[PDB]
Design a protein around this ligand. Structure first.
Ligand SMILES: *[C@@H]1O[C@H](CO[C@@H]2O[C@@H](C)[C@@H](O)[C@@H](O)[C@@H]2O)[C@@H](O[C@@H]2O[C@H](CO)[C@@H](O[C@@H]3O[C@H](CO[C@H]4O[C@H](CO)[C@@H](O)[C@H](O)[C@@H]4O)[C@@H](O)[C@H](O[C@H]4O[C@H](CO)[C@@H](O)[C@H](O)[C@@H]4O)[C@@H]3O)[C@H](O)[C@H]2NC(C)=O)[C@H](O)[C@H]1NC(C)=O
Ligand SMILES: *[C@@H]1O[C@H](CO)[C@@H](O[C@@H]2O[C@H](CO)[C@@H](O[C@@H]3O[C@H](CO)[C@@H](O)[C@H](O[C@H]4O[C@H](CO)[C@@H](O)[C@H](O)[C@@H]4O)[C@@H]3O)[C@H](O)[C@H]2NC(C)=O)[C@H](O)[C@H]1NC(C)=O
Ligand SMILES: *[C@@H]1O[C@H](CO)[C@@H](O[C@@H]2O[C@H](CO)[C@@H](O[C@@H]3O[C@H](CO)[C@@H](O)[C@H](O)[C@@H]3O)[C@H](O)[C@H]2NC(C)=O)[C@H](O)[C@H]1NC(C)=O
Ligand SMILES: *[C@@H]1O[C@H](CO)[C@@H](O[C@@H]2O[C@H](CO)[C@@H](O)[C@H](O)[C@H]2NC(C)=O)[C@H](O)[C@H]1NC(C)=O
Ligand SMILES: *[C@@H]1O[C@H](CO)[C@@H](O)[C@H](O)[C@H]1NC(C)=O
Length: 487
């Protein structure tokens, strides 16, 4: 059995390895029982060394480096000794910093060349040479893969050519812009790994464990107009995520759910929290405990598209993305953060309205949540949501008391109330009647019955671009959609 001495496929020139307090995992393949010495250099000087042996059967080897301050460059060498043989592997331009994995479906996959202001965005790289980029090839596998089968974009300094290399190819716009925003704040190296595929349901990205935890039914024939990518359970976890699970990382950002609009829709409130938890457990263990057990996990609540009037699948998914709380983090989704995108619509996208071109605001909103949840900063990252409600049935009023200050444009249809009479309920629009800094009063007088619930922005396309009715007055964040039941 002759096994080449090689690094795992996440290791390359120009890469970013996770910084202190974590140790960075370095692993590869080689000859059974050979000794592998991994050395970190700064030019010719030795910074640290780790020694291990190649395991029989798997022919794999692994070390965990001591924690490193962010920065660089460094070189990593691995040297295998077996009898009198001596082979060496070397990578250079290695940095230490925060490694973020970006995944999901086509609004993660959409690249910098596809977005608004693309020419200027593609040109803005000289200040960001320490924001290193990587993109995983579109591969599916019936079993978990130990190593990536193929890499589309190996670790690289960002350029016009590799940020905008092809339509839905690389580099992910949301991922790049998120990292660019992180660099502005952090001023130390950022590594970005994009691993996404259009038209894919969450089940494709989930291991068997999270699917079983949620009671997901066995697959039938799942391709439909809204599921155009790989849809067999776990096949993208298996090939495009699992091979990264031993690599130490900082967190994940995620943009997916469009393809669950008609595929296990009513389970998404389980399957998405369960994906987060299973990725966390699996990466924590694969990385020898170095990746945080509750590593921060950020996501984009679905944007809009120009749909049929009857369709309220997207509002349901948006709600389920928060585990039906309306906000994250929450009791079922610790250390998570969300960007609202329903107001970031695009009627004229050449990629279809499902692919809106403003990824800049998506990445800005994500980065606020990362600053708060992933970095501990006291920064506003959630939009205004009611904390309490007061029904004044005799006056025909419903007061909503918000979490934060509100800036409200008059809009008499954005809120609806569920009006129950004669053993049936109907949703009716609820006009805005009165305002104070944190309380909005709705009129319920058109309901000649009992009020069971209220909802806000519960439509596939609730508003025109950056024209939703309620924002915070200064954070720029929109009020998220919600439903609330009366007691
Ligand atoms: C296992 O291999 C280790 C890695 O070496 C590679 O793999 C092996 C199998 C060989 O094929 C080898 O050619 C590969 O480089 C090996 O460690 C390496 O060993 C070499 C050989 O001793 C070291 O290179 C020599 O370094 C000295 C010192 O260099 C310093 O000082 C000089 C002089 O002031 C400066 O000019 C340099 O910039 C450095 O600061 C050099 O003097 C010497 O040069 C002479 O020989 C070479 C050919 O070898 C000629 O081309 C030159 O013109 C000179 O005539 C070498 O360059 C190397 O530093 C070392 N690397 C490390 C990381 O330690 C190791 O010994 C092997 N281990 C085992 C267990 O067998
Ligand atoms: C189209 O794309 C271009 C290229 O991305 C974009 O221009 C850039 O806009 C940003 C603002 O988003 C400019 O950022 C400033 O740049 C200066 C000088 O380099 C910095 O000193 C500024 O720092 C402040 O702001 C940061 C947060 O943004 C903070 O982290 C920092 O502490 C400071 O407070 C700031 O980064 C940038 O200079 C230009 N770049 C170029 C090359 O023009 C343009 O806005 C885009 N337009 C649209 C309509 O999307
Ligand atoms: C990347 O991480 C995975 C874990 O997610 C590593 O697989 C795990 O490898 C460990 C250590 O070799 C295995 O543990 C051993 O199990 C045997 C039982 O056969 C036990 O007797 C040993 O004492 C030890 O505990 C573990 O089973 C295995 N886990 C899974 C889920 O496969 C993997 O090796 C890592 N990759 C590399 C290249 O190291
Ligand atoms: C996920 O969302 C679904 C759909 O809203 C929830 O299922 C509803 O839950 C109530 C309470 O058990 C039932 O009375 C409804 O009939 C259910 N509707 C459907 C269509 O099944 C479900 O409880 C949510 N699960 C989680 C974990 O939040
Ligand atoms: C999906 O799973 C089915 C059933 O096991 C299998 O026959 C099929 O080849 C798989 N599809 C792809 C695209 O691999």
């Amino acid at each position: 059995k002759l096994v080449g001495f090689r690094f795992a496929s996440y290791i390359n020139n120009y890469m970013v390895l996770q910084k202190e307090p974590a140790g960075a995992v370095i692993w590869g393949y080689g000859t059974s029982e050979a000794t592998v010495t991994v050395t970190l250099y700064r030019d010719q000087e030795t910074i640290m060394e780790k020694v291990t042996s190649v395991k029989a059967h798997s022919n794999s080897w692994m070390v965990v480096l001591d924690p490193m301050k962010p920065g660089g460059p460094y070189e990593v060498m691995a040297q295998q000794t077996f009898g009198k043989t001596n082979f060496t592997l070397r990578v250079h331009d290695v940095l230490f910093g925060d490694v973020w994995l970006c995944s999901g479906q086509s609004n993660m996959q959409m690249t910098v060349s596809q977005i608004f202001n693309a020419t200027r965005e593609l040109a803005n790289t000289a200040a960001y040479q320490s924001v290193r980029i990587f993109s995983v090839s579109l591969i599916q596998a019936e079993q978990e893969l130990e190593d990536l089968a193929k890499v589309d974009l190996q670790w690289a300094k960002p350029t016009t050519e590799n940020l905008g290399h092809g339509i839905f190819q690389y580099m992910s716009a949301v991922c790049w812009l998120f990292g660019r925003n992180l660099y502005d704040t952090l001023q130390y190296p950022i590594g970005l790994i994009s691993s996404s595929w259009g038209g894919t349901p969450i089940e494709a990205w989930s291991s068997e464990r999270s699917l079983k935890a949620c009671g997901v039914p066995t697959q039938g024939f799942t391709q439909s107009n809204s599921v155009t990518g790989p849809s067999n359970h776990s096949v993208l976890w298996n090939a495009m995520i699992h091979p990264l699970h031993n690599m130490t990382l900082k967190g994940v950002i995620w943009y997916q759910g469009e393809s669950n609009m008609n595929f296990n829709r009513d389970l998404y409130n389980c399957t998405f929290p369960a994906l987060i938890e299973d990725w966390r457990q699996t990466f924590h263990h694969g990385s020898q405990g170095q990746t945080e057990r509750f590593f921060p996990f950020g996501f984009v609540q679905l944007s809009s598209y120009l749909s049929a009037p009857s369709d309220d699948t997207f509002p349901q998914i948006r709600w389920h993305q928060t585990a039906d709380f309306g906000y994250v983090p929450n009791l079922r989704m610790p250390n998570t953060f969300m960007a609202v995108a329903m107001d970031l619509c695009d009627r004229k996208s050449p990629f279809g309205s499902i692919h809106p071109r403003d990824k800049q605001t998506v990445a800005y909103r994500l980065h606020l949540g990362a600053r708060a949840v992933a970095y501990g900063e006291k920064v506003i990252f959630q939009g205004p949501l009611p904390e309490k409600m007061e029904l004044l049935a005799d006056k025909g009023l419903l007061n909503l008391m918000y979490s934060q200050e509100i800036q409200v444009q008059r809009q008499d249809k954005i809120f609806e109330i569920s009006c129950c009479s004669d053993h049936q309920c109907k949703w009716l629009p609820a006009p805005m009647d009165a305002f104070s800094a944190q309380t909005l009063t709705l009129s319920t007088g058109s309901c000649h019955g009992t009020l069971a619930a209220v909802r806000y922005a519960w439509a596939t396309w609730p508003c025109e671009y950056k024209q939703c009715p309620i924002y915070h007055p200064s954070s720029t964040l929109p009020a998220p959609p919600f439903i609330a039941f009366m007691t």
